[PDB]
Design a binder for this molecule. Structure first.
Ligand code: GUN
Ligand code: GUN
Lengths: 186, 188
């Protein structure tokens, strides 16, 4: 279900520190800051490999799994895309995703366990589609947003592409839309 | 390694699920699985891959991945022993539960699933291929005694790669005859 893009106060202006409960989670699990924002850790990378044809044959692990957490101090996952589709599974909290297709269409939906209100707890972002995400205030998980992501073939930086500023965003969605989504781009 | 201490509704399931879970089941179209529990395949990758499988082996085509929601309830609190050639990624979403893994070696491992990682619980777990796995519901008022997870199989799930255990008979041959008596409620 479509969702209005109405970033909360701490999303537009990140807080210097996250609630102690989330900091503890970060420390105990040894999560590290992701280049696109948020905290993460690869917890699984298949022992099995596969060969795939890539536009310029390469080898990749069959799959990779990560924990990905957004917090009040790092509430945004900046726009980026992967050649491969990515499976997302909600575990704790609430968040919102914004997708920008190559043709320019923008889609946004909310993630949470209240499906009766349009929220989803499983979602796949097709390869080639730019995605960004931001934290939604929620009391159930101390204003945090924890999910698991699985990519097949397994993650490789060579298949990753981050969006470059509002300039590149402008080419895709136009000036007005680019301005509205600027807070989600590098 | 948690101890196998089944709740009352596990050894003797309730006739029907509680209203909150029945509503979830109906809204999501979850169907009772043969091995027990309710499930639904929500994604099967349109992309494929060729993999070698023993039969002497031969090449077969598989979808790159499959995803399902899997739910245990008081009326169906057990996910009976079954195995797959492929490893399976499990992601906890709601509730609590416990797994029992029987490796081909005969080794038995058991652990609890939940978000209290401070108490040994885990919210992500990968079961290697060839390992028989079973799960049972753990009481928890948080999710009205439900246990919801997501499972991702890579390569994607295919019946040709699936194997369910047949009663204590085969179970007894894998683990001690005495152990088969303790895990008997998770098989057949
Ligand atoms: N799996 C994985 N490893 C990474 N290392 C750096 N960035 C990433 C990422 O997005 N995924
Ligand atoms: N992924 C998946 N799809 C199925 N289709 C029928 N049964 C199953 C099953 O157990 N898993």
């Amino acid at each position: 279900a479509n969702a209005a893009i109405e970033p909360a106060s701490f999303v537009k202006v990140p807080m210097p520190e996250p609630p102690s409960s989330l900091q503890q989670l970060i420390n105990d699990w040894q999560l590290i800051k992701h280049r696109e924002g948020g905290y993460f850790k690869e917890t699984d990378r298949s022992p099995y490999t596969m060969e795939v044809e890539k536009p310029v044959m390469v080898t990749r692990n069959q799959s990779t799994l990560i924990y990905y957490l957004l917090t009040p101090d790092s509430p945004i996952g900046k726009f980026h895309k992967n050649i491969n589709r990515i499976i997302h599974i909600l575990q704790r909290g609430k968040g919102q995703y914004v997708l920008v297709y190559p043709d320019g269409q923008v889609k946004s939906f909310k993630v949470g366990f209240d499906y009766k209100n349009g929220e989803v707890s499983q979602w796949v972002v097709p390869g080639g589609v730019f995605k960004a995400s931001f934290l939604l205030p929620n009391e159930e998980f101390d204003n945090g947003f924890l999910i698991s992501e699985v990519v097949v073939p397994g993650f490789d930086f060579e298949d990753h592409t981050f969006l470059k500023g509002e300039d590149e965003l402008k080419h895709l969605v136009g000036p007005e839309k680019a301005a509205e989504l600027a807070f989600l781009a590098h």
